[PDB]
Write a protein that binds this ligand. Structure first.
Ligand SMILES: [Mg+2]
Ligand SMILES: [Mg+2]
Ligand SMILES: [Mg+2]
Lengths: 324, 101, 141, 52, 42
RNA sequence: ACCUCGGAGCAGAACCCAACCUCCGAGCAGUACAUGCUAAGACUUCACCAGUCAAAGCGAACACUCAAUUGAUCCA
RNA sequence: AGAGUGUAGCUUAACACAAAGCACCCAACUUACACUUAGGAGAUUCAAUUGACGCUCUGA
């Protein structure tokens, strides 16, 4: 009993009478490469994936490359394996070109889009700089994926973006204690005249991040939206409860997302203070519990089982005396 | 009469430790969350559902004879083997409130 | 107190939550084949006749961060994109990208000859001095 | 051609293990774990138990 | 043995010269092989 | 000549099953010296006795290869 | 003189963040080859979808 294949069977196309004439892999790497190519390709049989799933610009760049290739000193250094590339410069001009798409990839991986906009994706075109000032000299940056302690995020951060109205919103997606889907609002500055952020209307006062102890890592996202024309908007936790999806839906017409910057935070000492005097509540504490270990149904006669078998099914290790 | 074979077919719930298949030779290769014993027997590393799939076979580079076979294949050729997987059914754990401090 | 209203079971939707707590599952099987799937994150390096690319990829196959000589950012300061110093520059820049992405731990799984190569050794050195460990913490059961 | 011999440790005394040795070879000195001192210590051959 | 000339020390400008020669040679041989390929195809 | 163990004809495809016969082989060996300790869950030569695999953990390091290569109780 | 046209050898690679991926050559190991390592050279025929410079077939 045989059933014909439901599609092209692999290795069928290359199957020839003459095999000596055909070129072969001579290296492990060549086969490997072709293997990943096949793995990524869709298949009619059951797979692992199923179950576990400008002209002027070009000319200018070419000219620059030619000029860079012209020098002898750089070539010498390259040969000597001493040549270095400045990280500051490359970062600066990377943020301009290939920045937004990489940020999009990060946001996609962290699943911000699915939680915020219910699957909808946007490219964070405008560069956004958020920094939490610590002391009078130091400042902790907020990149995409960075981890910042709530102690450092106690005060409102400095927001700078080189652009010419705007709005910004900081949201904690997993911060919510009651409703899993819902998020906590932190601070929503609306109608921001250009780069200058101080002039903006304070819809909601700043509240520092409060991830509960033993609740794991919490992600907080700053979302910057471009505003076409002015529009009217609108310590208790209930008031802070919001969904970004609904808010954006109702403000879709006059307001579109432009920038994204997200950081991570664990519980810290400052969170206790946030809970105590600011929220005027007892601090919730969580712990990671695992499901109870599986044991098969106890038998009257455990055969060829060690003595310790019985200890698997007893609740208390202290001795019992029954009626006596 | 060694009684070797598949013990758990596709769609069967397994617990960690459960022996999926005894084989003598590598008929079924270990896939996701499936351990392999000394005797070449396959066992579940996780509690879940057993799946059988066809996956592209890339041997370890140190495995001399397999690499030799690979390097003798034509340019379009890829090798496939049967693989046993366990799709885990339960999450690692949950966070629950213990103290309203 | 309406503030003192908490769910009995806390829900955290962060994809990186359990990984950072080191309680997330890794794919422990695949012993017969190469490479291992037992990682949360992987450094994967593609060597081409014209370009070198280094990638940080999750187990699920989603890409996190990348350093490619194909990009103008790295091109503009490189004499040639196919050498040891190209790899070293890619190493340093990827380390910077990883730090800002918050990824501190990944595994690198080379072929023996690739490991023996000085270029990849210097890439690994760039990883180390970059602040990225090329060994992942063992998960907690 | 092989003999089973007893190996006794210099430290953590009273612990010994049996190992097989080529008959024509010299007396074995090994470095083996001792549970009494909870560390790897030197062991010497005392006598041949049997011939296998 | 190798007591004939154990010492082998050269300058830096000669290394630069060598590198340039090898680069030029690579280009030249590529061009020559191209000529060969063209003529055989023809 | 044979009596125990492993392989093929030999169940064409889960397991098991071809008595008698026709052939082959085994009764070792080599490398370690954590070939330490402990412990979920399982397999099993159709019983039992035997036999097999193994997560996690403690302690180390940065549960060997081989188809069989074997022997209960008593007793010394 | 007409027709067919057009990316380094190849590719209905190029939505874009980009001229990409295999081919090719030199040096080391190899008697060699192959692998690996270490380096090198490479292109959208020109001007505004259109017109004319290169290529192949048809006239003497
Ligand atoms: Mg039985
Ligand atoms: Mg029988
Ligand atoms: Mg273990």
């Amino acid at each position: 009993r045989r059933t014909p294949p439901l599609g092209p069977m692999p290795n069928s196309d290359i199957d020839l009478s003459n095999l000596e004439r055909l070129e072969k892999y001579r290296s492990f790497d060549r086969y490997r490469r072709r293997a990943e190519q096949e793995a990524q390709a869709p298949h009619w049989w059951r797979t692992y994936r199923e179950y576990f799933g400008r002209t002027q610009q070009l000319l200018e760049r070419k000219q620059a490359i030619q000029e860079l290739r012209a020098n002898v000193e750089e070539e010498r250094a390259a040969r000597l394996r001493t040549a270095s590339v400045p990280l500051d410069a490359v970062r600066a001009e990377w943020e301009r070109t290939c920045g937004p798409y990489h940020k999009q990839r990060l946001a996609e991986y962290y699943g911000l889009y699915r939680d915020l906009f219910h699957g909808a994706t946007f490219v964070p075109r405008v560069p956004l700089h958020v920094a939490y000032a610590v002391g009078e000299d130091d400042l902790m940056p907020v990149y995409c994926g960075n981890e910042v302690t709530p102690t450092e995020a106690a005060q409102a951060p400095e927001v700078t973006y080189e652009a010419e109205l705007w709005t910004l919103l900081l949201t904690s997606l997993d911060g919510h204690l009651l409703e899993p889907d819902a998020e906590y609002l932190h601070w929503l500055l609306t109608n921001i005249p250009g780069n200058r952020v101080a002039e903006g209307q304070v819809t909601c006062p700043y509240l520092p991040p409060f991830p509960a102890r033993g609740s794991g890592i919490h992600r907080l996202a700053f979302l910057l939206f471009k505003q076409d024309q002015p529009i009217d908007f609108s310590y208790q936790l209930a008031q802070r409860t919001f969904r970004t999806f609904d808010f954006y839906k109702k403000h879709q017409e006059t307001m579109t997302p432009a920038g994204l910057s997200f950081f991570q935070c664990r519980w810290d000492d400052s969170v206790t203070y946030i809970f105590h005097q600011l929220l005027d509540m007892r601090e919730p504490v969580f712990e990671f519990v695992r499901p109870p270990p599986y044991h098969p149904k106890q038998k009257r006669f455990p055969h060829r089982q060690p003595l310790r078998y019985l200890d698997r099914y007893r609740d208390s290790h202290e001795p019992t005396y029954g009626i006596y | 009469g060694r009684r070797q074979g598949i013990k758990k077919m596709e769609g069967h719930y397994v617990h960690a430790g459960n022996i999926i298949a005894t084989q003598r030779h590598f008929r079924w290769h270990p896939g996701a969350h499936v351990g392999v014993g000394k005797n070449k027997c396959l066992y579940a590393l996780e509690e879940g559902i057993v799946r059988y799939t066809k996956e592209v076979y890339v041997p370890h580079p140190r495995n001399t004879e397999a690499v030799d076979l690979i390097t003798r294949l034509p340019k379009g050729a890829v090798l496939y083997k049967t693989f046993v997987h366990v799709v885990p059914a339960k999450p690692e754990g949950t966070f629950k409130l213990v103290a309203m401090l | 107190v309406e503030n003192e209203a908490v769910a009995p079971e806390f829900t955290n939707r962060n994809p990186r939550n359990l990984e950072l707590l080191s309680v997330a599952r890794k794919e422990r099987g695949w012993r017969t084949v190469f490479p291992s799937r037992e990682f949360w994150h992987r450094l994967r390096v593609i060597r081409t006749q014209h370009h070198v690319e280094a990638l940080v990829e999750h187990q699920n196959g989603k890409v996190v961060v990348s350093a490619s000589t194909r990009e103008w950012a790295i091109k503009k300061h490189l004499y040639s994109t196919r050498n040891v110093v190209a790899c070293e520059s890619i190493g340093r820049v990827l380390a910077q990208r990883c730090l800002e992405a918050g990824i501190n731990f990944m595994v690198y799984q080379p072929t023996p000859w690739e490991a023996a190569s000085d270029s990849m050794k210097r890439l690994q050195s760039a990883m180390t001095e970059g602040g990225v460990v090329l060994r992942e913490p063992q998960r907690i059961y | 051609k092989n003999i089973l011999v007893r190996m006794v440790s210099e430290a953590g005394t009273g612990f010994c293990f049996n190992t097989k040795r080529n008959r024509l070879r010299e007396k074995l000195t090994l470095l083996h774990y001792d549970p009494v001192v909870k560390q790897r210590v030197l062991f010497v051959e005392k006598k041949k138990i049997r011939s296998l | 043995k190798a007591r004939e000339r154990p010492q082998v020390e050269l300058t830096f400008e000669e290394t630069e010269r060598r590198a340039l020669l090898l680069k030029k040679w690579s280009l030249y041989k590529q061009q020559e092989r191209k000529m060969e390929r063209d003529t055989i195809r023809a």
